[PDB]
Write a protein that binds this ligand. Structure first.
Ligand SMILES: [Cl-]
Ligand SMILES: [Cl-]
Ligand SMILES: [Cl-]
Lengths: 213, 213
């Protein structure tokens, strides 16, 4: 609370074109869904994520999740991360992760996401980011959220741009990804920008739609 | 709403022995799970179910859900029902329905529930009822909730008694169930009783457990 404001919590639900979307904390029983999607989407994920030095299938066995989940929840207990699951109609379809959380005179964090490729409804990732931003700039009392994305990652750049992230810079040789140190764009948005952002319009419309009897 | 206070809404989540439990509105995408479970559980449910005048397999076919769901949601829009789904770890595992809602000088409604047979006897129904009661006595601004249960339905009588329902009477030949008009006990609880009730203790403990980081 003092140590970890806004954690644990849920975010949403919203009703968006894909269905009902929400964020809620990672938990041990997510092992099966997490494993299934991460294994299936290896070609979508492995070359776009930081290198782990591990075999992908070994890493994403069902039996691997407990240690990972425990680690994420430990960081969240220290107020350094907020590890959410993206739900579509109550089902695990990905993760929305707030990381490197600081307060003091910085009050900033990064945000990362991934969504199962099998869910084709569209707007799931943007809704997740928009919910994450609203939660961070209210309950978590943050001032700024940033993200890093390779210039070559056309779909992710579009998702981030859509909800209102601004390009702030180009980080040279920033992260070890797909066998090399790769440039990443740095994008960001601050709390002053949220009310006029697409992210706010998405959440407001999503809540209005959800609340329609 | 003026017309439908407390609707639509979610209730919970709680963490209880069975897992994470919550209530949320019925929706069209529930057709597959509702149909699968109600068909599989025919012989657990049908001896206790008000008669519909049609074959169980016809009534609970996946293509039957849209009209049922639309009807429930229409009644809710008029403030006469609150039709919830019981979730366990985000999955449809039954229903919690508030019906015959009145306000004025009565402020009463009935509550009914069912839980998937493979999941029963684990605290899911008691949690669902406790959440229902809390929601009814706060957001829906009700004063009284009642339920009906056949004297022969020993497990349901135990579930209802556990959370604080009082026996008030025996309704002779009350509902058409399993081929005849069957006696049902009437049980009830009023808002004055909530603070000292097992229902309140369950919800408070469930909220506290959920909030543990
Ligand atoms: Cl949860
Ligand atoms: Cl919902
Ligand atoms: Cl139970």
């Amino acid at each position: 609370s003092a140590v970890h404001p806004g954690w644990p919590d849920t975010v949403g639900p919203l009703r968006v074109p894909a269905g009902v979307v929400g964020l809620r904390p990672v938990r041990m029983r997510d092992a099966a869904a997490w494993s299934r999607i991460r294994l299936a989407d290896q070609h979508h994920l492995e070359p776009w994520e930081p290198m782990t030095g591990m075999d992908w299938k070994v890493r994403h066995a069902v039996t691997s999740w407990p240690s990972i989940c425990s680690g994420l929840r430990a960081e969240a207990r220290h107020g350094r991360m907020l590890p959410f699951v993206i739900e579509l109609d109550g089902e695990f379809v990905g993760q929305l992760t707030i990381g490197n959380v600081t307060h003091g005179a910085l009050r900033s964090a990064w945000i990362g996401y991934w969504v199962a490729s099998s869910r084709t409804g569209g707007g799931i990732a943007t809704a997740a980011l928009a919910m994450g931003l609203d939660h961070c700039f209210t309950a978590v009392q943050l001032h700024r959220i940033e993200a890093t994305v390779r210039p070559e990652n056309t779909p992710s750049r579009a998702v981030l741009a859509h909800v209102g992230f601004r390009e702030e810079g180009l980080l040279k040789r920033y992260l070890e990804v797909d066998g090399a140190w790769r440039d990443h764009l740095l994008v960001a948005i601050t709390a002053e920008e949220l009310p006029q952002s697409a992210a706010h319009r998405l959440v407001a419309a999503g809540r209005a739609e959800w609340c329609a009897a």
